[PDB]
Design a protein around this ligand. Structure first.
Ligand SMILES: CO[C@@H](C(=O)O)c1cccc(OCc2ccccc2Cl)c1OCc1ccccc1Cl
Length: 130
């Protein structure tokens, strides 16, 4: 849709702090911190796929809007994820061990803007089309 495409990370703010708030240790934060992933979003029927690709780590999820799914995150959390589309924003929540984190993806001008919140920490990541 508005989201379908291949997107390259061009800026990131507070990602280390976000990872730390998730309880990510040093080695894994080091890997995530200066990574500049591509995110490839595609849709087929009811099923959206989001692939994230980087030199040291790749992940992929496929999901139906509103349908909870099991996910293993890049930092090896085992989470229950639900993704809905609200006012043009793809809203993802991940729930695990009585915690939650949200990942909101929106389109703004030429940007795919990704807001990641854990407790009091808010990270903003910006991607542009490859
Ligand atoms: C999946 O989309 C992106 C985005 O929208 O910026 C996104 C949203 C939320 C958490 C993310 O990584 C959480 C992480 C990543 C690495 C280490 C610890 C953690 Cl805790 C993330 O990047 C996914 C990633 C980032 C860098 C490298 C590969 C990947 Cl696979």
């Amino acid at each position: 849709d508005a989201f379908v495409g291949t997107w390259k990370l061009v800026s990131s703010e507070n990602f280390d702090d976000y990872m730390k708030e998730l309880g990510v240790g040093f080695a894994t934060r080091k890997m995530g911190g200066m990574a500049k992933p591509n995110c490839i979003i595609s849709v087929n029927g009811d099923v959206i796929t989001i692939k994230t690709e980087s030199t040291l780590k790749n992940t992929e999820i496929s999901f139906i809007l509103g349908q909870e799914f099991d996910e293993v995150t890049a930092d090896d959390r085992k989470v229950k994820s639900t993704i809905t589309l609200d006012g043009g924003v793809l809203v993802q929540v991940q729930k695990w061990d009585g915690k939650s984190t949200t990942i909101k993806r929106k389109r703004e001008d030429d940007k795919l803007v990704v807001e990641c919140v854990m407790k009091g920490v808010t990270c903003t990541r910006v991607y542009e089309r490859a």
